[PDB]
Design a protein around this nucleic acid. Structure first.
Lengths: 64, 107, 156
RNA sequence: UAGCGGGCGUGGAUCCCUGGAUGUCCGAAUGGGGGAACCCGGCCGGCGGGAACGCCGGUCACCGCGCUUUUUGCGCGGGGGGAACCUGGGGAACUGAAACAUCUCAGUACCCAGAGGAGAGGAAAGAGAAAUCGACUCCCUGAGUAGCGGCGAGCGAAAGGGGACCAGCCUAAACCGUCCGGCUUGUCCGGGCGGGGUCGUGGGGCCCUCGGACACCGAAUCCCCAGCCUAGCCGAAGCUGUUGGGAAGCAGCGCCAGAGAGGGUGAAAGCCCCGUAGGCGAAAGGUGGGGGGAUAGGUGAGGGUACCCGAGUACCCCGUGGUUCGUGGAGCCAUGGGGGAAUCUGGGCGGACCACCGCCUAAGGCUAAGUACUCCGGGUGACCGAUAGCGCACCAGUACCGUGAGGGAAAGGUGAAAAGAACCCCGGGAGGGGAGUGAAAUAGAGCCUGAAACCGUGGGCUUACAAGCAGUCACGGCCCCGCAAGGGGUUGUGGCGUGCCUAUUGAAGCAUGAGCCGGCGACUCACGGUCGUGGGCGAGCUUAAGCCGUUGAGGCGGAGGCGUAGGGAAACCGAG
RNA sequence: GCCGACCCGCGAGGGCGGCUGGAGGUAAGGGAAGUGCGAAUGCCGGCAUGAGUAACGAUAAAGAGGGUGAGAAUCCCUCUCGCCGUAAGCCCAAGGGUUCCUACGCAAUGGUCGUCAGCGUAGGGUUAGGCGGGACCUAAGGUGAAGCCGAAAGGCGUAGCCGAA
């Protein structure tokens, strides 16, 4: 019957209007200090794919 | 209550299995188990030879219990289904175009 | 099942110093009337069928009979009265023997009654059609009431 | 359950259907005891020739209610039972996040008490943004959105709208008399009574102008009639031949049908029988506004007033719980405590609060419907069929087991009917041997079938010079089928030949289970997605509950969901 | 079901034949699932394995004669023989409930057998004004009117009351 649909994943991801599981980079907070704008702009976004397809089965009903 | 078969106590014809195609005597109706008998199954029963109610050689029988739905009604005609009638005094059952059933006692 | 046994949860055997096997409460499919497992239940076989295609079939069914030429829609009958003689004579009128089938169609209380007892006259009428019924049977006996029933049934 | 037996029925019996007697003692038990069915008596009558003994009948428990002069009482009620369905005081743990304390099963089992064929709720101190809706329960969908969280597992709204169903009236306080006690006899503190009135466009109380009224809404209240429940009743249509123990079968001719639903009958029957389709009936006890009546009752303007309009309540603060809400800005709301008003200039929300603005009437109640569940009843099945199906198909909640709590079983078959084997032979009988019987006697009394495991009789074939996963291959010798060739099978000679299953890199292994054989025996259910696909429509696809309908009968029903545009956290832009 | 030296499939299996058996069966085209064993020291059932082997229940012991009955060292009738006697004799309380007593009976139970019973079928038997307990007494204790308390159950509990060999 009616299942959960998990909103953790939803609250931190966004597929590309079809099924290409794509999202945001990983590894902030505990960096900074010793670096420059290099990794700054580069922390911007991310790709994500492959096993995130299993992750695509995770979310289910809503799409969004 | 609920034993309204199709028989009473007089005389009727036979279409059975043992001696299919005979006729029924006075017809002792006993009991409500559909067991009926006239002169029908006249086989042979044992019963010991003891001096009391039995002769020196006890080995004989006559009429014996039988199934109810083995017979069919009749009247001064041939033998047809009994259809009932209000005599507006009593209640019996005439016959297909003809008549008689319990009509031997002012019926 | 194995938990709804008229027994108890009594785990008679210990686990260790015993003899033969190892078992919990008597309620288990490994025994006698001890509840089975995954089997037959008073369940529900049911689902949905889109009107369109469904009613395609409806039309198509009678249409398949309309593909063998085995039908007729009489107006008034010779067996109007729910008696057998007249209706049979009228069956002789329409050209019907004594070894066929009567998914009739038609909507007349009188007709259905007489034609209800008559052996090969399974009789069908229109407020509740059926395509199984026509596949298995054969004779759209009809009044146009049942045909007009067809019309508003497959309208589109 | 057969019988002896001696008695009752058309002067109408068993019998079912109704009411009534009977209903001993125990049983909330109930005078009072009390280890369950025993015992003791005070009391009114009765019986014993009956005072002394005993029984017959009458009485004698406790709590809650109003009258009763506190009196005795009189009237009232009460407790205890119950499968699940409902409510409440408290209330676990298993498990689950593979750990574990918060989060979870869960307010599930459990204990007790309560309540009814329904419960529960219910007329807004309501939603929540529509300056819009318009009492309550169920469903569907909104939407698994919104929303919560060691942001971990997981927990999950309502508004919306489409359906099931639709029901609406009163109190308290003000206020007007009236009866009773006190008393700081007061134009008084209150209460027993009656009318008064019920509000959210604020109502009314009361006082004065309107004219204030037959009619009008008519009940949930009483009174009926049709109709329903527990005995019953008519009932379509066949006759012959035949195989046989039995026909209904196969044949000839004929018929029945609102009836071909099924069961029976020695077998397979529309036509023989209960009955079916259909049609029909109740004295007795109960059921019913559907039709109806009547009854309870309920329906109208304005001025002035200004009296009331629910008090430890509302409201504030600390300790609280529900709500999607875990300490969050936490609102509402239910309350351990401390604190504590007002009377329409009265007060509860709009998620802290302030403002505005709409919303709305608390702190005293009630209300049918629709909704749920299944012991008992009928209906009726792609349900089982004697290790199944309930543990129970039968003298099963019984034999046996524990002190008890409690555990709990094994178990159907002659025939069509007993016709159930009389008479005689071996025996002490038990059992057989001839009989009769019925078609059938491996249908013979535990009697349809009667495998295998396992235990036996004769006979056909082999084996006593032999080293063995006992089988297989070539040959032969023997016994019996085969006309021929062939074949059965017996197994002497030799070629060969390391058990089944588990677990292992690796076993015939001395790592393992198995006595044999028979059976019951383990990959499933609604939905949730996912890939594929056989089809439909294809920019369109599709209904949920539920409604007319069915006697295995369809159809309907646009609420809603999605596909069509994506993207930005957002604001918003926009095939950008 | 039994038997098979015949037919068909590469196979699980399919067909034909006779005997047993006595009232069912169910194609082709489909479909709904407690569906396929051989193990699980399987649940159960039936029956074997050791196997004529250990044992017949304290090492205090029988013999005869006669009798009964189909059947006797096993029962019984008498002659004979040993073992106890702080018990291995007698009672009561307890408990068991026809076991009793008699006619018959061995198919069971009896640790063989059994004509025997303590078993069996049926009948027949248990006498109180004094025994013994109740129409008298309390103790520990419990219930329990009252009372105190407990969210529920109920705890706590005066007078009373049941209570004994």
């Amino acid at each position: 019957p009616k299942m959960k649909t998990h909103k953790g994943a939803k609250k931190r991801v966004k597929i590309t209007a079809s099924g290409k599981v794509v999202a945001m980079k990983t590894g902030k907070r505990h960096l900074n200090w010793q670096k420059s704008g290099k990794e700054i702009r580069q922390k911007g976004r991310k790709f994500v794919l492959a096993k995130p397809e299993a992750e695509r089965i995770k979310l289910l009903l809503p799409y969004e | 209550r609920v034993k309204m078969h199709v028989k009473k106590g007089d005389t009727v014809l036979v279409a059975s299995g043992k001696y299919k195609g005979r006729v029924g005597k006075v017809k002792e109706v006993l009991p409500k188990k559909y067991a009926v008998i006239v002169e029908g199954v006249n086989i042979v029963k044992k019963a010991v030879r003891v001096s009391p109610k039995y002769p020196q050689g006890g080995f004989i029988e006559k009429e014996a219990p039988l199934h109810a739905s083995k017979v069919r009604p009749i009247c001064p005609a041939c033998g047809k289904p009994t259809r009932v009638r209000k005599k507006f005094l009593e209640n019996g059952k005439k016959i297909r175009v003809c008549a008689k059933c319990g009509g031997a006692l002012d019926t | 099942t194995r938990g709804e046994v008229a027994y108890s949860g009594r785990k008679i055997w210990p686990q260790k110093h015993t003899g033969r096997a190892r078992h919990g409460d008597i309620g288990a499919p490994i025994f006698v009337g001890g509840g089975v497992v995954f089997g037959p239940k008073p369940r529900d076989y049911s689902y949905t069928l889109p009107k369109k295609v469904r009613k395609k079939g409806l039309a198509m069914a009678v249409a398949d009979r309309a593909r063998e030429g085995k039908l007729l829609l009489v107006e008034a009958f010779a067996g109007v009265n729910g008696k057998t003689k007249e209706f049979l004579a009228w069956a002789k009128e329409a050209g019907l023997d004594g070894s066929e089938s009567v998914l009739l169609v038609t909507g007349n209380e009188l007709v259905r009654r007489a034609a209800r007892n008559l052996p090969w006259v399974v009789t069908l009428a229109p407020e509740g059609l059926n395509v199984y019924d026509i596949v298995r049977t054969e004779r759209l006996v009809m009044d146009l009431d049942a045909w007009e029933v067809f019309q508003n049934r497959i309208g589109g």
